[PDB]
Amino acid sequence: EWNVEKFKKDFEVNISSLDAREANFDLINIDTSIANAFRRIMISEVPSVAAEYVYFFNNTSVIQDEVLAHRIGLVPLKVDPDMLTWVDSNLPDDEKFTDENTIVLSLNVKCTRNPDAPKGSTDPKELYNNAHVYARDLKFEPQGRQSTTFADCPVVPADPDILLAKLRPGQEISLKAHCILGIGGDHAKFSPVSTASYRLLPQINILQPIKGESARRFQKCFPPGVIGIDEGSDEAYVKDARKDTVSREVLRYEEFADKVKLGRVRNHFIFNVESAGAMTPEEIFFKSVRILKNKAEYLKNCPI
Amino acid sequence: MIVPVRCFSCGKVVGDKWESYLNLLQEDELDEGTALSRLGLKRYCCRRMILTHVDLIEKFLRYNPLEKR
Amino acid sequence: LKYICAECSSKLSLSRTDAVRCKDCGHRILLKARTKRLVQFEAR
Amino acid sequence: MYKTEKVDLALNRNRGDPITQHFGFGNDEWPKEWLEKLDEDGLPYIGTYVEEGDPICAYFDDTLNKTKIKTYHSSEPAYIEEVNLIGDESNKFQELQTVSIKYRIRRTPQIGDKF
Amino acid sequence: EKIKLLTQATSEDGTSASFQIVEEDHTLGNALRYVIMKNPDVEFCGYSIPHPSENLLNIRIQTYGETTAVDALQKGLKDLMDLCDVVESKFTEKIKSM
Amino acid sequence: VYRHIKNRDVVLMNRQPTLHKASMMGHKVRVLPNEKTLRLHYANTGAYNADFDGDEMNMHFPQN
RNA sequence: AAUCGAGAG
Ligand SMILES: [Mg+2]
Ligand SMILES: [Zn+2]
Ligand SMILES: [Zn+2]
């Protein structure tokens, strides 16, 4: 029989690393049906905040307005998604945006020629003033209660160095961007992960002994820290499977064609998660788990 | 024309690395693979986005209808 | 000032029933300037 | 996609006859609703979003004592890229009888496009 | 509106029904189907998406008896909730451990 | 009532050049929500001599 | 409306 208790006995997690952007960990004794659910929720269903509505007031630059709005929608914003609610689309445009669900960013930048530039200068930063527009130039314009709620943490891009646009003297950009909550299954700009995926733990079943110089070349067919030579007997053994990238270079030699079988542990998933910047990868994974549970609970409580 | 904000395949923000890539190519005498690795681009999907960018925006910008030439 | 000479790029105002030419130089091509207006977009 | 159309108000007249049609609005009573596509000189604002039947350029025709508009004829919405005023080479000074209008249409890859 | 019983496919005794779920895809379908196939009372279980361009999920549950397809669906949903709870708790334990 | 074409309607499809009557058949219309192309099953490609590399084909709506 | 030129299957 299968039971939640029998799953709780055998399931375990091995966090290999954890940063503010990337978290590498393991899920053991779980089914692909649930690991894939977690991965799909991380990529598509976990909400984040991105620029959606752009209100241009002037754009005399070479980049056209739709392209510039698309770029401004792509830049990730360091906003905690819980700090704002969801936009009610059915409401009219006047009352649709409010201080609890919309974040206003502005970008006003004019390019003027630098009258102190040296002769023979080819650097645009020395020839012109504001010849480059960066995501850091996206000022945050708090309105209403967010002037107090966001005082602890001002909204800035996760990558202020993103080169939004370039300018030349006389040219200018003046725009407002409205940032709301959305999910990545709608538009890829709301996806909060650079990439979240997994891979089964590789298995390297050595069938016959590889004693001798053959161990030197057999170990040469894998990533450096995967096969080792035993201190006692000159034998090859599997040190670390996680270090193996499955490239089957050993299979390309008929010497080992009947000495090793390459397989996988069909329940040992190595989740690698990277964050765009708005949330930590561990919190992304936690939110995906919670989303699956909450959607199941909504189905349970829905009348049939 | 101008560097893309994100990598097309995975979505990693690579729009803040074009100027650094040029700096590491010019000031440091780094080859393209070394510069891409030192920018943090490991997946070839992310490497291609910077390794193959053309940067036509600079050539577009020389035709300025708002300044005397 | 709502027009720009296509060659010398000097801003010039062209009144109605007036000769369509740059005042500074003799260029008969004028470019309409883009003035400040609200233009909504989707960041998609 | 970029498309340039040429509005040549000098189509009806020929060879030194008076200027029957002048760009802009007359002193008539025309709907104020089409002031959000056209400037006060009967030309479109740069960057506006045009569709089917939206005004493109207003002209005032004395032969009818009325203000008529030319409209955008395409089922694909576009954006005004640039408006070029063209003056004739003749040393006799005239008004504007030709504005060139440039359209920008967003060609996002759709299901059906060829790669 | 979220969950609908397809009457044309349900059985009179209720032991073989078919459910249409809106705004769902493989993510919930595969997990729910795997969890329901852990009930020793269900005979047949699977999920199908009629058209990929529509966000509609179909779940079929046929039981051997002594329960219904609705009861099997409820049990699978609750088991999925508990599975998520144990995953969350173990992940938090290992986070605090570190 | 000039009602819109529903899912219970039938349509006539044709790809030029019409070399034989199998290149003009009746189809039951299934209305999709997304695109602006006509979607065809693969088994009809043998009859229509059609491939999905730029081919377009007509869709006639009988009225009585 | 023709004529010419460019295309698609
Ligand atoms: Mg064909
Ligand atoms: Zn990438
Ligand atoms: Zn001039």
Side-chain angles (χ1 to χ4, degrees), chain E residues 18-79:
Chain E
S18 204
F19 305 91
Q20 170 120 302
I21 319 187
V22 318
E23 298 286 345
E24 300 296 343
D25 62 336
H26 308 277
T27 298
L28 174 79
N30 206 15
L32 197 51
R33 191 261 306 152
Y34 155 89
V35 167
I36 291 169
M37 284 291 276
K38 294 304 184 180
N39 192 340
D41 192 73
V42 300
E43 172 223 350
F44 185 93
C45 187
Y47 79 101
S48 66
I49 318 188
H51 195 241
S53 302
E54 304 185 337
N55 45 36
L56 295 177
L57 176 75
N58 287 164
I59 302 279
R60 190 77 196 289
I61 301 177
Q62 296 172 166
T63 79
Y64 291 114
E66 104 191 13
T67 51
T68 62
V70 172
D71 289 341
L73 179 68
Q74 293 284 320
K75 185 189 171 180
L77 281 170
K78 179 193 173 185
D79 292 325

Side-chain angles (χ1 to χ4, degrees), chain B:
Chain B
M1 196 189 55
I2 186 171
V3 61
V5 179
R6 303 170 171 271
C7 170
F8 293 141
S9 308
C10 64
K12 180 185 169 60
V13 169
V14 306
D16 57 357
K17 298 174 178 298
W18 169 251
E19 307 189 9
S20 315
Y21 175 61
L22 283 183
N23 280 125
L24 272 54
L25 286 179
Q26 179 76 282
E27 305 159 23
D28 322 18
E29 291 280 26
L30 283 191
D31 54 71
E32 300 79 20
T34 308
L36 287 159
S37 305
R38 281 188 42 179
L39 291 178
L41 304 180
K42 317 160 310 303
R43 295 182 287 266
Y44 62 113
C45 74
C46 293
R47 297 164 68 85
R48 104 202 184 269
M49 294 292 295
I50 300 297
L51 179 77
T52 60
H53 185 244
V54 178
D55 201 56
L56 233 57
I57 179 72
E58 293 299 341
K59 188 177 288 181
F60 266 62
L61 285 160
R62 302 200 67 80
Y63 303 97
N64 188 9
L66 298 166
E67 189 197 13
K68 308 209 173 181
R69 35 191 176 82

Side-chain angles (χ1 to χ4, degrees), chain A residues 252-285:
Chain A
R252 260 184 53 243
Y253 307 99
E254 76 289 343
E255 165 177 358
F256 313 104
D258 44 326
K259 275 82 168 186
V260 55
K261 167 181 169 53
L262 307 163
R264 288 187 179 274
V265 193
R266 291 318 195 285
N267 294 330
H268 191 300
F269 302 84
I270 310 170
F271 274 83
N272 183 36
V273 188
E274 315 175 357
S275 186
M279 309 158 61
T280 68
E282 54 266 18
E283 187 182 350
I284 301 282
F285 188 85

Side-chain angles (χ1 to χ4, degrees), chain A:
Chain A
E1 195 187 1
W2 181 93
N3 198 2
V4 173
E5 275 59 21
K6 290 189 189 63
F7 172 64
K8 186 171 190 171
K9 191 180 86 169
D10 307 307
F11 173 63
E12 65 181 66
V13 185
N14 288 10
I15 308 186
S16 184
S17 69
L18 189 148
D19 305 356
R21 290 292 173 90
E22 174 187 338
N24 189 258
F25 56 93
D26 290 3
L27 260 47
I28 332 289
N29 306 326
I30 198 176
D31 201 56
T32 83
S33 158
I34 307 291
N36 206 33
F38 291 152
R39 181 194 65 92
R40 293 168 60 99
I41 297 165
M42 295 174 90
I43 301 190
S44 45
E45 196 82 22
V46 170
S48 68
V49 185
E52 175 82 316
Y53 305 98
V54 187
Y55 303 82
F56 271 84
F57 290 104
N58 191 6
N59 177 20
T60 59
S61 58
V62 173
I63 297 101
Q64 40 271 53
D65 306 17
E66 68 270 0
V67 168
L68 190 42
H70 175 253
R71 297 179 71 83
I72 294 175
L74 280 190
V75 42
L77 309 179
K78 282 199 56 58
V79 192
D80 182 58
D82 310 337
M83 288 184 189
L84 54 172
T85 65
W86 277 84
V87 160
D88 291 307
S89 182
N90 325 27
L91 291 193
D93 312 316
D94 299 5
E95 290 158 335
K96 184 165 71 173
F97 304 96
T98 39
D99 62 349
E100 78 284 351
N101 44 22
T102 317
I103 283 181
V104 187
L105 301 179
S106 58
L107 174 68
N108 304 272
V109 43
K110 291 168 283 302
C111 187
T112 55
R113 177 172 288 274
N114 193 23
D116 304 332
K119 291 175 298 183
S121 181
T122 350
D123 165 63
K125 189 160 297 183
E126 204 158 352
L127 287 175
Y128 324 92
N129 296 328
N130 316 352
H132 296 293
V133 188
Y134 292 94
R136 71 173 86 108
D137 306 321
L138 287 160
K139 304 313 169 179
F140 169 56
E141 294 291 325
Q143 297 191 12
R145 197 71 66 87
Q146 70 186 192
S147 72
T148 53
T149 72
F150 275 92
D152 44 9
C153 48
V155 172
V156 302
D159 310 66
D161 265 335
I162 294 178
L163 177 55
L164 286 189
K166 298 179 173 187
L167 289 176
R168 281 309 188 262
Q171 302 180 358
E172 66 159 318
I173 303 167
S174 168
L175 58 89
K176 286 200 171 191
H178 278 182
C179 322
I180 68 179
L181 270 181
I183 65 174
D186 172 26
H187 194 95
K189 76 192 174 187
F190 292 116
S191 179
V193 298
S194 130
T195 175
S197 45
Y198 57 70
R199 59 185 174 101
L200 278 356
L201 173 66
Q203 265 191 10
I204 318 175
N205 290 338
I206 302 193
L207 306 180
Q208 305 167 27
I210 319 293
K211 288 182 299 297
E213 273 286 335
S214 296
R216 275 86 187 181
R217 53 182 60 86
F218 176 91
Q219 177 231 305
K220 210 188 177 191
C221 288
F222 288 83
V226 184
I227 304 297
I229 313 301
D230 197 6
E231 289 76 348
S233 177
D234 198 330
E235 292 208 18
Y237 70 103
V238 174
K239 322 168 67 168
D240 209 16
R242 283 180 46 121
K243 278 293 304 171
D244 197 357
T245 68
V246 184
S247 61
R248 301 183 172 79
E249 315 280 27
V250 60
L251 302 190
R252 260 184 53 243
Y253 307 99
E254 76 289 343
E255 165 177 358
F256 313 104
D258 44 326
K259 275 82 168 186
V260 55
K261 167 181 169 53
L262 307 163
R264 288 187 179 274
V265 193
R266 291 318 195 285
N267 294 330
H268 191 300
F269 302 84
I270 310 170
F271 274 83
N272 183 36
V273 188
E274 315 175 357
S275 186
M279 309 158 61
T280 68
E282 54 266 18
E283 187 182 350
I284 301 282
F285 188 85
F286 173 84
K287 284 217 177 183
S288 73
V289 166
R290 292 288 301 171
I291 283 178
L292 186 54
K293 190 256 186 177
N294 294 326
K295 109 199 318 178
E297 185 185 349
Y298 188 67
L299 271 195
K300 265 191 74 60
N301 301 18
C302 272
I304 176 60

